[PDB]
Amino acid sequence: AHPELKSSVPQADSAVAAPEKIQLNFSENLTVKFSGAKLTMTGMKSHSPMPVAAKVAPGADPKSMVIIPREPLPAGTYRVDWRAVSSDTHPITGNYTFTVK
């Protein structure tokens, strides 16, 4: 069972106020430790993408992974790149973007 992205907070293509908490919810169970995610600032409110210092861990809910930034996110557009894998599959990947007001 491939863990596809079911939803996220902030949602893809949403514009949100002061996040500090990014949660990815998947369709199937995933092994977090073999999965991963990255947060990149792609358009600070054209420039090279800037990697964001953040921790990645299993979220409280089954099928979830959280990205916890080290500090507040400046306003601008961000891209989340994720890789999810289950004990019986090889990694699948995805990406989406959201905006911080």
Side-chain angles (χ1 to χ4, degrees), residues 43-67:
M44 207 172 137
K45 185 191 184 186
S46 296
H47 64 74
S48 286
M50 305 288 294
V52 178
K55 27 186 172 159
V56 174
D61 311 288
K63 305 186 167 186
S64 78
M65 269 208 291
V66 290
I67 298 171

Side-chain angles (χ1 to χ4, degrees), residues 3 6 23 26 28 30 33 35 39 46-48 50 57 61 64 66-67 75 82 85 91 93 95 97-98:
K6 291 325 278 295
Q23 185 166 307
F26 296 89
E28 303 296 339
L30 78 168
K33 69 182 182 193
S35 296
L39 182 67
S46 296
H47 64 74
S48 286
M50 305 288 294
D61 311 288
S64 78
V66 290
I67 298 171
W82 57 272
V85 71
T93 66
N95 62 268
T97 282
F98 66 90

Side-chain angles (χ1 to χ4, degrees), residues 10-98:
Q11 298 199 286
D13 306 313
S14 66
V16 65
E20 188 57 62
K21 43 259 183 307
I22 309 287
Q23 185 166 307
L24 290 64
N25 300 307
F26 296 89
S27 65
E28 303 296 339
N29 301 296
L30 78 168
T31 305
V32 69
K33 69 182 182 193
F34 292 115
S35 296
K38 177 179 71 173
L39 182 67
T40 173
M41 178 176 83
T42 56
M44 207 172 137
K45 185 191 184 186
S46 296
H47 64 74
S48 286
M50 305 288 294
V52 178
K55 27 186 172 159
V56 174
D61 311 288
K63 305 186 167 186
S64 78
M65 269 208 291
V66 290
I67 298 171
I68 320 175
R70 188 180 62 181
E71 51 263 327
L73 300 184
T77 301
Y78 289 81
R79 168 180 169 131
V80 174
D81 279 278
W82 57 272
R83 296 181 305 116
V85 71
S86 76
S87 63
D88 294 47
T89 58
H90 279 285
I92 49 269
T93 66
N95 62 268
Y96 63 88
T97 282
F98 66 90

